[PDB]
Amino acid sequence: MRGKITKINENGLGVLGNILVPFAYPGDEVEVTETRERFGKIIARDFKLMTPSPLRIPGKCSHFGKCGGCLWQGLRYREQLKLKEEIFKRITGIEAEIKGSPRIWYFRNISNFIITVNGIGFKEFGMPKTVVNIRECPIFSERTPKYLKALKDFLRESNLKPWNWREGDVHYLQVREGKFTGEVMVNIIAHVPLNYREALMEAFNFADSIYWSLKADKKDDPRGFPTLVLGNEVIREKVEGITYLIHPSVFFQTNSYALPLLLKSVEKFCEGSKVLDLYSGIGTLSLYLAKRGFEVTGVEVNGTSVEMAKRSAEINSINATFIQGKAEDAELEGYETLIVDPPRKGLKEFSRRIVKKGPNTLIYVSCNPLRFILDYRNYLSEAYKVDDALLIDMFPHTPHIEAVIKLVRR
Numbered sequence: 001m002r003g004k005i006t007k008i009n010e011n012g013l014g015v016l017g018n019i020l021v022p023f024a025y026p027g028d029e030v031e032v033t034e035t036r037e038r039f040g041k042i043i044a045r046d047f048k049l050m051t052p053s054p055l056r057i058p059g060k061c062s063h064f065g066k067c068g069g070c071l072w073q074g075l076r077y078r079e080q081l082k083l084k085e086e087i088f089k090r091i092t093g094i095e096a097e098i099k100g101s102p103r104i105w106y107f108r109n110i111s112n113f114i115i116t117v118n119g120i121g122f123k124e125f126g127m128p129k130t131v132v133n134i135r136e137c138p139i140f141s142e143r144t145p146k147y148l149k150a151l152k153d154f155l156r157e158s159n160l161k162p163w164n165w166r167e168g169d170v171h172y173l174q175v176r177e178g179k180f181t182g183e184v185m186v187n188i189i190a191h192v193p194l195n196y197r198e199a200l201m202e203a204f205n206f207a208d209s210i211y212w213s214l215k216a217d218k219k220d221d222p223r224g225f226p227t228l229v230l231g232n233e234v235i236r237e238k239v240e241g242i243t244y245l246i247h248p249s250v251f252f253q254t255n256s257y258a259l260p261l262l263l264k265s266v267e268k269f270c271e272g273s274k275v276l277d278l279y280s281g282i283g284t285l286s287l288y289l290a291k292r293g294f295e296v297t298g299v300e301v302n303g304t305s306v307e308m309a310k311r312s313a314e315i316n317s318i319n320a321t322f323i324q325g326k327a328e329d330a331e332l333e334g335y336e337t338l339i340v341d342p343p344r345k346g347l348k349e350f351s352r353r354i355v356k357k358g359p360n361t362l363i364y365v366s367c368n369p370l371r372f373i374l375d376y377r378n379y380l381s382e383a384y385k386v387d388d389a390l391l392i393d394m395f396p397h398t399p400h401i402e403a404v405i406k407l408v409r410r
């Protein structure tokens, strides 16, 4: 099958009739040789690029369909941004403008490198994979080669078996950086206890924090019961003059460079002074808002995250409240604005509670617009209507989108 790629689909794959072609983009003239059935979709196993779309970076990226590394690496950056606006609108029927990442290389502040018998890779969960070789798409750090050399040296000295997909001593090397502080946390994720304390400390002597996280299951997901091996308990990231604390056990917004744009977006959409920030994390939005004079209550399920937020508040002299709990059970009355940042599965049934008891301004933060619009169509629209929306490109070179949607009551 030969033809011209007409659009990209929701997951950022180029469409060729009833074929999906990874790394092909709109305008490409392609020739597909092998396809593979994938849960009722036909996906191109490889293609030859006959004619480059005008969207591609001129050079090698206009001669080969797969320049390398990242699914969208071959698209010029401005052109990726417009394709993100298109997808968002196609999914939600909202026209939202996107703000680019101030920096489009080495922007992520975390990486879970999986350690396999086939060697070390950037892990991502889910099947239209978007970062397939981090050597040809350096989205994380300039120190990545030093992080990996260290790990290899440690696996030498500590004779320790990688993940062979059924078992293995070690499983992931998690590295986290504070982009604006220099601090580096190293978190080995393992299926055995640490024996080579000295070998590990030596290999990662440059890290400010070394952890060893013990997994109690064999599942392929990067989480444990962490043990400080050496150095600081946490690392610091600094954004908009706010010191945030990062622990192996917590989630933090992924792009320290685009994060000011997410913070100012949310602020622009706030209404009144009393803000409830559910899924409040290690205080990313809450501290930013409260520091700017909002009265801010944040609720987060992860207890370690909530501690981090409390400590940040002290460090920064911010006046705000932080509570452990599930967003499902937080009291919504008495507020002017509600922010939600749900996980990928969305609000789900919490929407009925928001429909009844929610405040006048609802702000919804979603890295997954298909799930947003479904929450909206299925529940929120009863009570709410979209008033405004912005996009932030937190994940350059890949089709992922971070949306900030402002809804108000009818």
Ligand code: NA
Pocket: 134, 137, 138, 139, 140, 141, 142, 144
């Ligand atoms: Na990298």
